[PDB]
């Protein structure tokens, strides 16, 4: 395959074919981030630095940028952030470990092995929790 | 693609098309603004200094001037202030980081990463607040 982007034109030679039509680039706002997968080994500077992936991995990509798939990457998930006051939290588990912690403060964006933990509760707490904002003619008898 | 604007009258030479008809220019007071992301990393120095935006960014615009939208941003939005006599207030949420806050006072024009904030009440406090503008005959009985 090949991968070609940009304000160009050209003809399909013969034996040639696109993939999939004509796609447009994903751009990216700082709240928006993509999840994606190595298939083969691969190096990719965008930047001063080059970041190195296995035939297995995953990365995640954020920021305000655009991004072109490239021959070797398949895109996995799209994520956004998620808005969080103070005194606002989730909670979310290292896949890779297992330890479900609970963030809690800023807006925050589940980065790479981690995904959301639903956290249960016994029965009858759930009943106690929101009835508890104002339980005064409860109280009262 | 090619943005026109002025008093000018040309012709479509063969090839070229309008992309959406003749448009008129966006005129803006000091009460509207509008808020507008960047497809491309851009320079647009209208005034002496010079603002440089990425390829996902957002921005405000608001004031009394003429704009004309460039090939590389798309407008996203239609903002006015909010008019706000002292001692009233709205709540909004900075979206970047997460923090709701109050703000109270002037007339106000919510920026790029804000959002109204809903504020929601216990059951029962919101049928007290009105009622207390004047309870006079609830209090004697």
New interface residues.
């Given amino acids: 395959k090949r991968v070609v982007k940009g304000e160009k034109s050209f003809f399909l030679q013969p034996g040639e074919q696109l993939e999939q039509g004509i796609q447009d680039v994903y ?6 981030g993509l999840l994606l997968r190595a298939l083969q080994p691969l190096e990719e500077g965008e930047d001063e630095e080059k970041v190195s992936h296995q035939a297995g991995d995953h990365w995640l990509i954020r ?4 991004y072109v798939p490239s021959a070797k990457v398949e895109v996995v998930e799209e994520r956004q952030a998620i ?4 005194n ?1 939290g989730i909670y979310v588990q290292d896949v890779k470990t297992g330890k479900v912690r609970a963030v809690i ?3 925050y964006m589940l980065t790479q092995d981690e995904v959301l933990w639903e956290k249960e509760l016994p029965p009858g707490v759930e009943e106690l929790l929101n009835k508890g ?2 339980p ?1 003619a409860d109280r009262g008898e």
Same sequence: chains 1, 2.
């Fill in positions: 751009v990216l706002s700082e709240q928006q920021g305000p940028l655009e808005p969080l006051d103070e606002e403060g800023s807006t904002q104002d005064l």
